[model samples]
Target: AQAFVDATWPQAAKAAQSLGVPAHFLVAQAALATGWGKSQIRNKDGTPSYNLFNIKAGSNWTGKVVEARTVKVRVERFRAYDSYEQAFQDYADLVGNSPRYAKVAGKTDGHAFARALQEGGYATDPSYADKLARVINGNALRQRLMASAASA
Candidate 1:
Protein backbone atom coordinates (compact mmCIF):
# COMPACT_ATOMS: atom_id res chain seq x y z
CA ALA A 1 0.00 0.00 0.00
CA GLN A 2 2.86 2.33 0.80
CA ALA A 3 4.59 1.83 -2.50
CA PHE A 4 1.41 2.14 -4.49
CA VAL A 5 0.21 5.14 -2.49
CA ASP A 6 3.55 6.89 -2.68
CA ALA A 7 3.98 6.24 -6.38
CA THR A 8 0.51 7.31 -7.44
CA TRP A 9 -0.22 10.00 -4.85
CA PRO A 10 1.54 12.65 -6.89
CA GLN A 11 -0.42 11.79 -9.97
CA ALA A 12 -3.58 11.60 -7.93
CA ALA A 13 -2.90 15.02 -6.42
CA LYS A 14 -2.33 16.52 -9.82
CA ALA A 15 -5.50 15.01 -11.13
CA ALA A 16 -7.52 16.24 -8.17
CA GLN A 17 -6.12 19.76 -8.29
CA SER A 18 -6.49 20.02 -12.03
CA LEU A 19 -9.96 18.51 -12.09
CA GLY A 20 -11.41 20.34 -9.08
CA VAL A 21 -11.90 17.10 -7.27
CA PRO A 22 -10.30 16.56 -3.89
CA ALA A 23 -7.00 14.74 -3.79
CA HIS A 24 -8.55 12.05 -1.63
CA PHE A 25 -11.37 11.88 -4.11
CA LEU A 26 -8.84 11.16 -6.81
CA VAL A 27 -7.15 8.64 -4.55
CA ALA A 28 -10.49 7.10 -3.73
CA GLN A 29 -11.38 7.03 -7.39
CA ALA A 30 -8.11 5.34 -8.23
CA ALA A 31 -8.62 2.93 -5.37
CA LEU A 32 -11.98 2.10 -6.83
CA ALA A 33 -10.64 2.00 -10.39
CA THR A 34 -7.64 -0.18 -9.62
CA GLY A 35 -9.34 -2.00 -6.78
CA TRP A 36 -6.64 -0.93 -4.37
CA GLY A 37 -4.13 -2.00 -7.01
CA LYS A 38 -5.61 -5.47 -6.87
CA SER A 39 -7.43 -5.47 -10.17
CA GLN A 40 -6.22 -8.08 -12.60
CA ILE A 41 -5.24 -5.68 -15.37
CA ARG A 42 -3.26 -3.29 -13.17
CA ASN A 43 -1.55 -6.15 -11.39
CA LYS A 44 -0.72 -7.98 -14.58
CA ASP A 45 0.07 -5.24 -17.06
CA GLY A 46 0.69 -2.36 -14.65
CA THR A 47 -1.79 -0.28 -16.65
CA PRO A 48 -5.33 -0.26 -17.91
CA SER A 49 -6.84 0.23 -21.33
CA TYR A 50 -10.02 2.11 -20.64
CA ASN A 51 -10.16 5.27 -18.56
CA LEU A 52 -9.94 5.04 -14.79
CA PHE A 53 -13.64 5.69 -14.32
CA ASN A 54 -14.23 3.00 -16.93
CA ILE A 55 -15.79 5.29 -19.45
CA LYS A 56 -16.59 3.17 -22.46
CA ALA A 57 -14.96 3.91 -25.75
CA GLY A 58 -17.22 5.44 -28.29
CA SER A 59 -15.84 6.29 -31.73
CA ASN A 60 -12.47 6.99 -30.12
CA TRP A 61 -11.28 3.68 -28.71
CA THR A 62 -8.79 1.69 -30.76
CA GLY A 63 -7.17 -0.50 -28.16
CA LYS A 64 -7.38 -4.24 -27.55
CA VAL A 65 -9.94 -6.14 -25.46
CA VAL A 66 -13.68 -5.74 -25.34
CA GLU A 67 -14.77 -6.60 -21.80
CA ALA A 68 -14.65 -5.16 -18.29
CA ARG A 69 -16.56 -5.77 -15.07
CA THR A 70 -18.99 -4.28 -12.59
CA VAL A 71 -20.70 -5.48 -9.47
CA LYS A 72 -23.78 -6.99 -11.06
CA VAL A 73 -22.55 -7.54 -14.63
CA ARG A 74 -19.55 -7.76 -16.89
CA VAL A 75 -19.07 -5.37 -19.76
CA GLU A 76 -17.52 -7.26 -22.59
CA ARG A 77 -15.29 -5.77 -25.28
CA PHE A 78 -14.31 -2.77 -23.18
CA ARG A 79 -11.73 -0.33 -24.56
CA ALA A 80 -8.10 -0.50 -23.46
CA TYR A 81 -5.22 1.96 -22.97
CA ASP A 82 -1.43 1.85 -23.09
CA SER A 83 -0.54 2.99 -19.61
CA TYR A 84 -1.98 4.08 -16.29
CA GLU A 85 -1.05 7.65 -17.17
CA GLN A 86 -3.13 7.39 -20.30
CA ALA A 87 -6.06 6.20 -18.27
CA PHE A 88 -5.48 9.09 -15.84
CA GLN A 89 -5.31 11.50 -18.76
CA ASP A 90 -8.57 10.18 -20.11
CA TYR A 91 -10.08 10.65 -16.66
CA ALA A 92 -9.27 14.37 -16.77
CA ASP A 93 -10.44 14.64 -20.35
CA LEU A 94 -13.69 12.85 -19.66
CA VAL A 95 -14.44 15.07 -16.70
CA GLY A 96 -13.61 18.20 -18.64
CA ASN A 97 -15.51 17.14 -21.74
CA SER A 98 -18.79 16.12 -20.17
CA PRO A 99 -21.39 18.07 -18.24
CA ARG A 100 -21.97 15.19 -15.89
CA TYR A 101 -19.07 16.07 -13.65
CA ALA A 102 -18.95 19.76 -14.47
CA LYS A 103 -20.59 20.66 -11.20
CA VAL A 104 -17.69 19.21 -9.28
CA ALA A 105 -15.04 20.78 -11.40
CA GLY A 106 -12.16 22.65 -9.70
CA LYS A 107 -13.84 22.46 -6.32
CA THR A 108 -11.65 21.01 -3.62
CA ASP A 109 -14.53 20.76 -1.21
CA GLY A 110 -14.84 17.01 -0.86
CA HIS A 111 -18.33 16.72 0.57
CA ALA A 112 -20.14 18.77 -1.99
CA PHE A 113 -17.89 17.42 -4.66
CA ALA A 114 -18.67 13.84 -3.77
CA ARG A 115 -22.35 14.67 -3.73
CA ALA A 116 -22.07 16.25 -7.12
CA LEU A 117 -20.35 13.24 -8.58
CA GLN A 118 -22.97 10.98 -7.10
CA GLU A 119 -25.79 13.17 -8.25
CA GLY A 120 -24.22 13.21 -11.70
CA GLY A 121 -24.19 9.46 -12.06
CA TYR A 122 -20.44 9.23 -12.06
CA ALA A 123 -20.62 5.55 -11.29
CA THR A 124 -23.11 2.83 -12.04
CA ASP A 125 -22.94 1.70 -8.46
CA PRO A 126 -25.88 2.72 -6.34
CA SER A 127 -23.59 3.41 -3.41
CA TYR A 128 -21.01 5.25 -5.43
CA ALA A 129 -21.67 8.60 -3.83
CA ASP A 130 -21.53 7.37 -0.29
CA LYS A 131 -18.39 5.43 -1.00
CA LEU A 132 -16.65 8.48 -2.34
CA ALA A 133 -17.64 10.56 0.64
CA ARG A 134 -16.46 7.93 3.03
CA VAL A 135 -13.13 7.60 1.33
CA ILE A 136 -12.63 11.31 1.08
CA ASN A 137 -13.48 11.90 4.72
CA GLY A 138 -11.45 9.00 5.97
CA ASN A 139 -8.06 10.07 4.74
CA ALA A 140 -5.46 12.83 4.92
CA LEU A 141 -4.50 12.27 1.31
CA ARG A 142 -5.98 15.62 0.37
CA GLN A 143 -3.47 17.40 2.58
CA ARG A 144 -0.69 15.62 0.77
CA LEU A 145 -2.00 16.99 -2.49
CA MET A 146 -2.65 20.47 -1.09
CA ALA A 147 0.92 20.77 0.11
CA SER A 148 2.29 19.95 -3.30
CA ALA A 149 -0.26 21.73 -5.46
CA ALA A 150 0.81 25.30 -4.62
CA SER A 151 4.39 24.49 -5.53
CA ALA A 152 3.46 22.30 -8.44
Candidate 2:
Protein backbone atom coordinates (compact mmCIF):
# COMPACT_ATOMS: atom_id res chain seq x y z
CA ALA A 1 0.00 0.00 0.00
CA GLN A 2 3.03 2.31 0.00
CA ALA A 3 2.30 3.66 -3.45
CA PHE A 4 -1.28 4.26 -2.51
CA VAL A 5 -0.23 5.89 0.75
CA ASP A 6 2.27 8.09 -0.99
CA ALA A 7 -0.27 9.20 -3.55
CA THR A 8 -3.09 9.74 -1.07
CA TRP A 9 -1.48 11.22 2.03
CA PRO A 10 -1.26 14.85 0.93
CA GLN A 11 -4.85 15.30 -0.06
CA ALA A 12 -5.90 13.10 2.84
CA ALA A 13 -4.05 15.43 5.16
CA LYS A 14 -5.66 18.45 3.57
CA ALA A 15 -9.13 16.97 3.81
CA ALA A 16 -8.56 15.83 7.36
CA GLN A 17 -7.31 19.25 8.40
CA SER A 18 -10.23 20.97 6.74
CA LEU A 19 -12.73 18.57 8.29
CA GLY A 20 -11.11 18.53 11.73
CA VAL A 21 -10.73 14.73 11.70
CA PRO A 22 -7.62 12.61 12.00
CA ALA A 23 -5.77 12.27 8.70
CA HIS A 24 -5.26 8.56 9.29
CA PHE A 25 -8.99 7.99 9.23
CA LEU A 26 -9.22 9.45 5.77
CA VAL A 27 -6.38 7.33 4.46
CA ALA A 28 -7.39 4.20 6.28
CA GLN A 29 -10.98 4.40 5.13
CA ALA A 30 -9.94 4.95 1.55
CA ALA A 31 -7.44 2.13 1.77
CA LEU A 32 -10.04 -0.26 3.05
CA ALA A 33 -12.57 0.90 0.48
CA THR A 34 -10.26 0.65 -2.51
CA GLY A 35 -7.88 -2.14 -1.47
CA TRP A 36 -5.09 0.37 -1.24
CA GLY A 37 -6.01 1.68 -4.70
CA LYS A 38 -5.88 -1.66 -6.43
CA SER A 39 -9.62 -2.15 -6.61
CA GLN A 40 -10.83 1.38 -7.17
CA ILE A 41 -13.92 2.04 -9.20
CA ARG A 42 -13.44 2.56 -12.92
CA ASN A 43 -15.46 4.09 -15.71
CA LYS A 44 -17.18 1.93 -18.32
CA ASP A 45 -14.32 2.72 -20.66
CA GLY A 46 -11.88 1.34 -18.05
CA THR A 47 -10.66 4.73 -16.99
CA PRO A 48 -9.86 5.50 -13.39
CA SER A 49 -12.83 7.18 -11.78
CA TYR A 50 -10.80 8.58 -8.86
CA ASN A 51 -13.62 7.77 -6.48
CA LEU A 52 -11.38 6.67 -3.67
CA PHE A 53 -14.02 6.73 -0.97
CA ASN A 54 -16.60 4.74 -2.91
CA ILE A 55 -19.06 7.55 -2.27
CA LYS A 56 -22.13 7.05 -4.39
CA ALA A 57 -23.56 9.73 -6.61
CA GLY A 58 -26.49 10.56 -4.43
CA SER A 59 -29.25 13.12 -4.67
CA ASN A 60 -26.87 15.82 -3.47
CA TRP A 61 -24.32 15.14 -6.18
CA THR A 62 -24.44 17.02 -9.47
CA GLY A 63 -21.21 15.56 -10.76
CA LYS A 64 -20.34 12.97 -13.36
CA VAL A 65 -21.28 9.42 -12.51
CA VAL A 66 -19.85 6.02 -13.34
CA GLU A 67 -21.05 2.47 -13.04
CA ALA A 68 -18.81 0.28 -10.99
CA ARG A 69 -19.15 -2.99 -9.17
CA THR A 70 -19.25 -2.46 -5.45
CA VAL A 71 -17.74 -4.77 -2.84
CA LYS A 72 -21.13 -6.41 -2.86
CA VAL A 73 -20.55 -7.31 -6.52
CA ARG A 74 -23.36 -5.09 -7.70
CA VAL A 75 -22.82 -2.22 -10.09
CA GLU A 76 -23.78 1.13 -8.66
CA ARG A 77 -23.64 4.85 -9.36
CA PHE A 78 -20.39 6.33 -8.10
CA ARG A 79 -19.34 9.92 -8.25
CA ALA A 80 -16.50 10.48 -10.68
CA TYR A 81 -13.92 13.16 -9.96
CA ASP A 82 -11.27 14.90 -11.96
CA SER A 83 -8.67 14.30 -9.26
CA TYR A 84 -8.05 12.64 -5.93
CA GLU A 85 -8.04 16.00 -4.16
CA GLN A 86 -11.55 16.77 -5.31
CA ALA A 87 -12.67 13.29 -4.29
CA PHE A 88 -11.26 13.81 -0.83
CA GLN A 89 -12.94 17.19 -0.57
CA ASP A 90 -16.28 15.70 -1.54
CA TYR A 91 -15.83 13.01 1.11
CA ALA A 92 -14.94 15.59 3.72
CA ASP A 93 -17.98 17.64 2.80
CA LEU A 94 -20.19 14.57 2.83
CA VAL A 95 -19.33 13.84 6.42
CA GLY A 96 -19.00 17.40 7.62
CA ASN A 97 -22.31 18.62 6.19
CA SER A 98 -24.38 15.70 7.40
CA PRO A 99 -26.02 16.18 10.80
CA ARG A 100 -25.97 12.43 11.34
CA TYR A 101 -22.17 12.53 11.47
CA ALA A 102 -22.12 15.38 13.98
CA LYS A 103 -20.24 13.29 16.50
CA VAL A 104 -17.49 12.74 14.00
CA ALA A 105 -16.82 16.38 13.19
CA GLY A 106 -13.67 17.74 14.83
CA LYS A 107 -12.90 14.36 16.33
CA THR A 108 -9.29 13.22 16.08
CA ASP A 109 -9.81 9.83 17.66
CA GLY A 110 -10.08 7.46 14.73
CA HIS A 111 -11.74 4.64 16.68
CA ALA A 112 -14.44 6.88 18.07
CA PHE A 113 -14.88 8.60 14.75
CA ALA A 114 -15.18 5.27 12.96
CA ARG A 115 -17.82 4.14 15.41
CA ALA A 116 -19.72 7.36 14.95
CA LEU A 117 -19.58 7.03 11.20
CA GLN A 118 -20.82 3.44 11.44
CA GLU A 119 -23.63 4.46 13.75
CA GLY A 120 -24.55 7.14 11.27
CA GLY A 121 -24.86 4.52 8.52
CA TYR A 122 -21.73 5.42 6.66
CA ALA A 123 -21.24 1.80 5.58
CA THR A 124 -23.48 -1.18 5.17
CA ASP A 125 -20.98 -3.47 6.87
CA PRO A 126 -21.86 -4.15 10.48
CA SER A 127 -18.18 -4.42 11.40
CA TYR A 128 -17.12 -1.21 9.67
CA ALA A 129 -16.01 0.46 12.86
CA ASP A 130 -13.97 -2.50 13.95
CA LYS A 131 -12.44 -2.93 10.52
CA LEU A 132 -11.47 0.75 10.34
CA ALA A 133 -9.94 0.66 13.80
CA ARG A 134 -7.96 -2.44 12.91
CA VAL A 135 -6.72 -0.92 9.67
CA ILE A 136 -5.54 2.27 11.37
CA ASN A 137 -3.85 0.46 14.22
CA GLY A 138 -2.42 -2.34 12.11
CA ASN A 139 -0.98 0.04 9.56
CA ALA A 140 0.61 2.21 12.25
CA LEU A 141 -1.01 5.25 10.69
CA ARG A 142 -1.48 6.90 14.08
CA GLN A 143 2.19 6.61 14.87
CA ARG A 144 3.11 7.98 11.47
CA LEU A 145 0.75 10.87 12.09
CA MET A 146 2.51 11.63 15.36
CA ALA A 147 5.87 11.51 13.64
CA SER A 148 4.64 13.74 10.83
CA ALA A 149 3.33 16.26 13.36
CA ALA A 150 6.58 16.23 15.29
CA SER A 151 8.57 16.80 12.10
CA ALA A 152 6.36 19.74 11.22
Candidate 3:
Protein backbone atom coordinates (compact mmCIF):
# COMPACT_ATOMS: atom_id res chain seq x y z
CA ALA A 1 0.00 0.00 0.00
CA GLN A 2 3.00 2.26 0.43
CA ALA A 3 3.71 2.01 -3.27
CA PHE A 4 0.11 2.96 -3.94
CA VAL A 5 0.42 5.87 -1.55
CA ASP A 6 3.76 6.90 -3.05
CA ALA A 7 2.43 6.92 -6.57
CA THR A 8 -0.24 9.52 -5.79
CA TRP A 9 1.85 12.04 -3.86
CA PRO A 10 3.92 13.56 -6.64
CA GLN A 11 1.02 14.37 -8.91
CA ALA A 12 -1.02 15.54 -5.94
CA ALA A 13 1.76 17.88 -4.94
CA LYS A 14 2.02 19.23 -8.45
CA ALA A 15 -1.70 19.86 -8.61
CA ALA A 16 -1.85 21.49 -5.19
CA GLN A 17 1.01 23.89 -5.83
CA SER A 18 -0.07 24.79 -9.34
CA LEU A 19 -3.78 25.14 -8.64
CA GLY A 20 -3.67 26.60 -5.12
CA VAL A 21 -5.69 23.60 -4.04
CA PRO A 22 -5.01 22.09 -0.65
CA ALA A 23 -2.54 19.24 -1.23
CA HIS A 24 -4.48 17.02 1.13
CA PHE A 25 -7.57 17.68 -0.92
CA LEU A 26 -5.85 16.33 -3.97
CA VAL A 27 -4.61 13.35 -1.97
CA ALA A 28 -8.08 12.56 -0.68
CA GLN A 29 -9.57 12.91 -4.13
CA ALA A 30 -7.06 10.52 -5.62
CA ALA A 31 -7.77 8.04 -2.86
CA LEU A 32 -11.45 8.27 -3.58
CA ALA A 33 -11.08 8.20 -7.35
CA THR A 34 -8.95 5.10 -7.70
CA GLY A 35 -10.00 3.31 -4.50
CA TRP A 36 -6.44 3.59 -3.22
CA GLY A 37 -5.05 2.33 -6.54
CA LYS A 38 -7.04 -0.85 -6.09
CA SER A 39 -9.31 0.10 -8.90
CA GLN A 40 -9.28 -1.72 -12.20
CA ILE A 41 -7.22 0.96 -13.91
CA ARG A 42 -3.90 -0.13 -12.42
CA ASN A 43 -2.08 -3.03 -14.09
CA LYS A 44 -0.40 -6.10 -12.65
CA ASP A 45 2.64 -5.37 -14.81
CA GLY A 46 3.15 -1.98 -13.09
CA THR A 47 2.14 0.16 -16.08
CA PRO A 48 -1.14 2.04 -15.95
CA SER A 49 -2.82 4.20 -18.57
CA TYR A 50 -6.47 4.19 -17.59
CA ASN A 51 -6.68 7.69 -16.24
CA LEU A 52 -9.82 7.83 -14.11
CA PHE A 53 -10.46 11.48 -13.58
CA ASN A 54 -13.13 11.36 -16.23
CA ILE A 55 -11.14 13.69 -18.45
CA LYS A 56 -12.69 14.29 -21.82
CA ALA A 57 -10.96 13.17 -24.95
CA GLY A 58 -9.16 16.08 -26.47
CA SER A 59 -7.50 16.10 -29.90
CA ASN A 60 -4.79 13.73 -28.74
CA TRP A 61 -7.18 11.02 -27.61
CA THR A 62 -7.83 8.36 -30.21
CA GLY A 63 -9.39 5.69 -28.04
CA LYS A 64 -12.75 4.37 -29.09
CA VAL A 65 -14.64 4.18 -25.81
CA VAL A 66 -14.06 6.60 -22.99
CA GLU A 67 -16.69 5.73 -20.49
CA ALA A 68 -16.82 6.13 -16.69
CA ARG A 69 -19.22 6.87 -13.88
CA THR A 70 -20.01 10.50 -13.25
CA VAL A 71 -22.13 12.22 -10.65
CA LYS A 72 -25.27 12.14 -12.75
CA VAL A 73 -24.70 9.61 -15.47
CA ARG A 74 -22.24 7.10 -16.79
CA VAL A 75 -20.18 9.22 -19.11
CA GLU A 76 -19.13 7.62 -22.37
CA ARG A 77 -16.41 8.63 -24.81
CA PHE A 78 -14.66 10.56 -22.07
CA ARG A 79 -10.97 11.15 -22.56
CA ALA A 80 -8.46 8.79 -20.96
CA TYR A 81 -4.83 9.69 -20.41
CA ASP A 82 -1.52 7.85 -20.58
CA SER A 83 -0.64 8.12 -16.91
CA TYR A 84 -1.89 8.98 -13.43
CA GLU A 85 0.19 12.14 -13.58
CA GLN A 86 -1.72 13.18 -16.66
CA ALA A 87 -4.98 12.39 -14.95
CA PHE A 88 -4.08 14.45 -11.88
CA GLN A 89 -2.90 17.26 -14.12
CA ASP A 90 -6.15 17.31 -16.01
CA TYR A 91 -8.15 17.22 -12.78
CA ALA A 92 -6.28 20.19 -11.40
CA ASP A 93 -6.46 22.02 -14.72
CA LEU A 94 -10.16 21.44 -15.06
CA VAL A 95 -10.94 22.58 -11.55
CA GLY A 96 -8.65 25.58 -11.62
CA ASN A 97 -9.42 26.81 -15.12
CA SER A 98 -13.12 26.15 -15.27
CA PRO A 99 -15.57 28.72 -13.97
CA ARG A 100 -17.62 25.95 -12.44
CA TYR A 101 -15.10 25.46 -9.65
CA ALA A 102 -14.63 29.14 -8.88
CA LYS A 103 -16.47 29.01 -5.57
CA VAL A 104 -14.41 26.21 -4.12
CA ALA A 105 -10.96 27.35 -5.24
CA GLY A 106 -8.88 28.40 -2.24
CA LYS A 107 -11.90 28.75 -0.01
CA THR A 108 -10.35 26.72 2.84
CA ASP A 109 -13.84 26.23 4.27
CA GLY A 110 -14.43 22.59 3.54
CA HIS A 111 -18.22 22.50 3.92
CA ALA A 112 -18.75 25.74 2.05
CA PHE A 113 -16.26 24.77 -0.61
CA ALA A 114 -17.82 21.38 -1.08
CA ARG A 115 -21.33 22.76 -1.30
CA ALA A 116 -20.25 25.40 -3.74
CA LEU A 117 -18.45 22.84 -5.85
CA GLN A 118 -21.64 20.87 -6.18
CA GLU A 119 -23.88 23.88 -6.72
CA GLY A 120 -21.43 25.35 -9.20
CA GLY A 121 -21.59 22.24 -11.35
CA TYR A 122 -18.24 20.70 -10.58
CA ALA A 123 -19.63 17.22 -11.07
CA THR A 124 -22.77 15.57 -12.35
CA ASP A 125 -23.11 13.56 -9.14
CA PRO A 126 -25.47 15.25 -6.72
CA SER A 127 -23.43 14.00 -3.80
CA TYR A 128 -20.07 14.93 -5.24
CA ALA A 129 -19.41 17.95 -3.06
CA ASP A 130 -20.54 16.26 0.12
CA LYS A 131 -18.31 13.32 -0.57
CA LEU A 132 -15.35 15.55 -1.18
CA ALA A 133 -16.08 17.55 1.93
CA ARG A 134 -16.44 14.42 3.97
CA VAL A 135 -13.05 13.31 2.77
CA ILE A 136 -11.64 16.72 3.53
CA ASN A 137 -13.05 17.06 7.01
CA GLY A 138 -13.32 13.48 8.20
CA ASN A 139 -9.66 12.70 7.79
CA ALA A 140 -8.59 16.15 8.99
CA LEU A 141 -7.19 16.72 5.55
CA ARG A 142 -8.07 20.39 5.66
CA GLN A 143 -6.44 20.67 9.05
CA ARG A 144 -3.38 19.00 7.62
CA LEU A 145 -3.21 21.72 5.02
CA MET A 146 -3.41 24.32 7.74
CA ALA A 147 -0.71 22.58 9.76
CA SER A 148 1.61 22.27 6.76
CA ALA A 149 1.26 25.92 5.90
CA ALA A 150 1.88 26.93 9.49
CA SER A 151 5.03 24.80 9.56
CA ALA A 152 6.26 26.28 6.32
Candidate 4:
Protein backbone atom coordinates (compact mmCIF):
# COMPACT_ATOMS: atom_id res chain seq x y z
CA ALA A 1 0.00 0.00 0.00
CA GLN A 2 2.83 2.37 0.84
CA ALA A 3 4.53 1.58 -2.43
CA PHE A 4 1.34 2.19 -4.35
CA VAL A 5 0.85 5.47 -2.50
CA ASP A 6 4.40 6.53 -3.21
CA ALA A 7 4.01 5.89 -6.91
CA THR A 8 0.51 7.23 -7.39
CA TRP A 9 -0.50 9.93 -4.89
CA PRO A 10 0.74 12.96 -6.77
CA GLN A 11 -0.90 11.97 -10.01
CA ALA A 12 -4.02 10.86 -8.19
CA ALA A 13 -4.25 14.24 -6.51
CA LYS A 14 -3.87 16.01 -9.83
CA ALA A 15 -6.36 13.71 -11.47
CA ALA A 16 -8.85 14.24 -8.68
CA GLN A 17 -8.61 17.98 -9.11
CA SER A 18 -9.09 17.74 -12.87
CA LEU A 19 -11.85 15.21 -12.63
CA GLY A 20 -13.67 17.10 -9.89
CA VAL A 21 -13.73 14.09 -7.59
CA PRO A 22 -12.20 13.46 -4.21
CA ALA A 23 -8.56 12.41 -4.10
CA HIS A 24 -9.26 9.67 -1.62
CA PHE A 25 -12.01 8.34 -3.79
CA LEU A 26 -9.75 8.14 -6.83
CA VAL A 27 -7.02 6.43 -4.81
CA ALA A 28 -9.46 4.04 -3.21
CA GLN A 29 -10.87 3.01 -6.57
CA ALA A 30 -7.38 2.37 -7.91
CA ALA A 31 -6.51 0.39 -4.80
CA LEU A 32 -9.59 -1.72 -5.24
CA ALA A 33 -8.95 -2.22 -8.95
CA THR A 34 -5.27 -3.13 -8.69
CA GLY A 35 -5.18 -4.53 -5.16
CA TRP A 36 -2.79 -1.79 -4.14
CA GLY A 37 -0.81 -2.36 -7.33
CA LYS A 38 -0.31 -6.06 -6.73
CA SER A 39 -2.92 -7.48 -9.05
CA GLN A 40 -2.00 -5.53 -12.16
CA ILE A 41 -2.17 -7.34 -15.48
CA ARG A 42 1.11 -7.90 -17.29
CA ASN A 43 2.41 -8.09 -20.80
CA LYS A 44 3.32 -11.42 -22.35
CA ASP A 45 7.00 -10.61 -21.82
CA GLY A 46 6.32 -9.98 -18.12
CA THR A 47 6.26 -6.20 -18.36
CA PRO A 48 3.82 -4.15 -16.32
CA SER A 49 0.58 -3.41 -18.16
CA TYR A 50 0.03 -0.35 -15.94
CA ASN A 51 -3.71 -0.70 -16.31
CA LEU A 52 -4.63 0.07 -12.73
CA PHE A 53 -8.31 0.57 -13.46
CA ASN A 54 -8.88 -2.56 -15.57
CA ILE A 55 -10.23 -0.48 -18.42
CA LYS A 56 -10.76 -2.39 -21.64
CA ALA A 57 -9.53 -1.29 -25.03
CA GLY A 58 -12.68 -0.75 -26.92
CA SER A 59 -12.99 0.34 -30.54
CA ASN A 60 -12.35 4.00 -29.74
CA TRP A 61 -8.93 3.31 -28.25
CA THR A 62 -5.99 3.80 -30.59
CA GLY A 63 -3.26 3.47 -28.00
CA LYS A 64 -1.09 0.51 -27.21
CA VAL A 65 -2.88 -2.56 -25.89
CA VAL A 66 -2.13 -5.92 -24.37
CA GLU A 67 -4.03 -9.14 -24.18
CA ALA A 68 -4.59 -10.68 -20.76
CA ARG A 69 -7.10 -12.84 -18.99
CA THR A 70 -9.92 -11.17 -17.12
CA VAL A 71 -11.77 -14.44 -16.69
CA LYS A 72 -10.76 -18.06 -16.70
CA VAL A 73 -8.99 -18.49 -20.03
CA ARG A 74 -10.75 -15.49 -21.52
CA VAL A 75 -8.19 -13.10 -22.88
CA GLU A 76 -9.27 -9.51 -23.30
CA ARG A 77 -7.67 -6.38 -24.72
CA PHE A 78 -6.66 -3.79 -22.16
CA ARG A 79 -5.17 -0.39 -22.64
CA ALA A 80 -1.50 -0.15 -21.71
CA TYR A 81 0.10 3.09 -20.66
CA ASP A 82 3.72 4.14 -20.53
CA SER A 83 3.31 5.34 -16.94
CA TYR A 84 0.84 5.50 -14.11
CA GLU A 85 0.22 9.16 -14.84
CA GLN A 86 -0.85 8.32 -18.38
CA ALA A 87 -3.07 5.58 -17.04
CA PHE A 88 -4.77 8.00 -14.70
CA GLN A 89 -5.20 10.52 -17.49
CA ASP A 90 -6.84 7.90 -19.70
CA TYR A 91 -9.08 6.94 -16.82
CA ALA A 92 -10.01 10.56 -16.33
CA ASP A 93 -10.76 10.79 -20.04
CA LEU A 94 -12.90 7.65 -19.90
CA VAL A 95 -15.00 8.95 -17.04
CA GLY A 96 -15.04 12.53 -18.13
CA ASN A 97 -16.07 11.97 -21.74
CA SER A 98 -18.66 9.27 -21.16
CA PRO A 99 -22.25 10.29 -20.68
CA ARG A 100 -22.88 7.26 -18.50
CA TYR A 101 -20.47 8.61 -15.93
CA ALA A 102 -21.62 12.21 -16.20
CA LYS A 103 -23.12 12.04 -12.75
CA VAL A 104 -19.98 10.55 -11.31
CA ALA A 105 -17.92 13.53 -12.39
CA GLY A 106 -18.01 16.57 -10.07
CA LYS A 107 -19.31 14.50 -7.18
CA THR A 108 -17.76 15.54 -3.86
CA ASP A 109 -18.93 12.44 -2.02
CA GLY A 110 -16.84 9.37 -2.61
CA HIS A 111 -19.72 7.07 -1.89
CA ALA A 112 -21.87 8.91 -4.38
CA PHE A 113 -19.25 8.48 -7.07
CA ALA A 114 -18.92 4.82 -6.23
CA ARG A 115 -22.64 4.34 -6.43
CA ALA A 116 -22.83 6.21 -9.68
CA LEU A 117 -20.01 4.10 -11.11
CA GLN A 118 -21.73 0.88 -10.20
CA GLU A 119 -25.07 2.17 -11.44
CA GLY A 120 -23.44 3.17 -14.71
CA GLY A 121 -22.16 -0.38 -15.26
CA TYR A 122 -18.54 0.35 -14.64
CA ALA A 123 -17.87 -3.22 -13.56
CA THR A 124 -19.50 -6.60 -13.77
CA ASP A 125 -19.03 -7.36 -10.11
CA PRO A 126 -22.28 -7.14 -8.23
CA SER A 127 -20.64 -5.60 -5.18
CA TYR A 128 -18.49 -3.09 -7.01
CA ALA A 129 -19.92 -0.10 -5.20
CA ASP A 130 -19.93 -1.81 -1.83
CA LYS A 131 -16.33 -2.88 -2.20
CA LEU A 132 -15.22 0.62 -3.24
CA ALA A 133 -16.97 2.02 -0.18
CA ARG A 134 -15.15 -0.44 2.03
CA VAL A 135 -11.82 0.46 0.50
CA ILE A 136 -12.59 4.18 0.75
CA ASN A 137 -13.66 3.82 4.38
CA GLY A 138 -10.96 1.43 5.52
CA ASN A 139 -8.93 2.82 8.37
CA ALA A 140 -5.49 2.43 6.83
CA LEU A 141 -6.42 3.88 3.45
CA ARG A 142 -8.54 6.58 5.04
CA GLN A 143 -5.64 7.65 7.21
CA ARG A 144 -3.31 7.65 4.22
CA LEU A 145 -5.66 9.76 2.16
CA MET A 146 -6.35 12.12 5.04
CA ALA A 147 -2.65 12.59 5.65
CA SER A 148 -2.08 13.30 2.00
CA ALA A 149 -4.94 15.75 1.94
CA ALA A 150 -3.62 17.49 5.04
CA SER A 151 -0.18 17.75 3.58
CA ALA A 152 -1.52 19.13 0.33
Best model number under lDDT: 4
lDDT of 2 by residue, 1-152 (tens): 56677778899989888778877788999988888788888887877889998888888789999987654487788899988988888888878788887788787776888888886778967888888888877746655555545365
TM-score of each: 0.71, 0.86, 0.66, 0.90
Which runs of model 2 end up more than 4 angstroms from their true locations?
A: 71-73, 140-152
Error of 4 at 19 (Å): 1.8
Question: What is residue 110's positional error in candidate 4, in angstroms?
Answer: 2.4
* Candidate 3, pairs of clashing residues: 56-79, 57-79, 66-78, 71-124, 71-125, 72-124
Using alpha carbons, what is the TM-score of model 1?
0.71
**Model 4: how far is 64 from its true place, Å?**
0.8
How far out, in Å, is residue 27 in model 2? 0.4
Candidate 2 has its poorest 10 consecutive residues by lDDT at 143-152
Lowest lDDT sum, 10 consecutive residues, model 4, at 143-152
Give candidate 1 regions above 4 Å deviation: 40-51, 63-66, 69-75, 139-152
Which structure among the candidates has the greatest TM-score? Answer: 4
- Residue range 7-35, candidate 3, lDDT tens digits: 66678788877766666666666656666
How well is each residue in 4-25 modelled by candidate 1, as lDDT tens digits?
4555676666777787665567
Predictions: Cα RMSD each: 4.2, 2.7, 5.0, 2.0
lDDT of model number 1: 0.62
Compared with the true structure, all predictions reach lDDT values of 0.62, 0.81, 0.63, 0.83
- Give the lDDT ranking, best first: 4, 2, 3, 1
lDDT of 4 by residue, 89-146 (tens): 9888878788888788788766788988886678867778778888887897967666
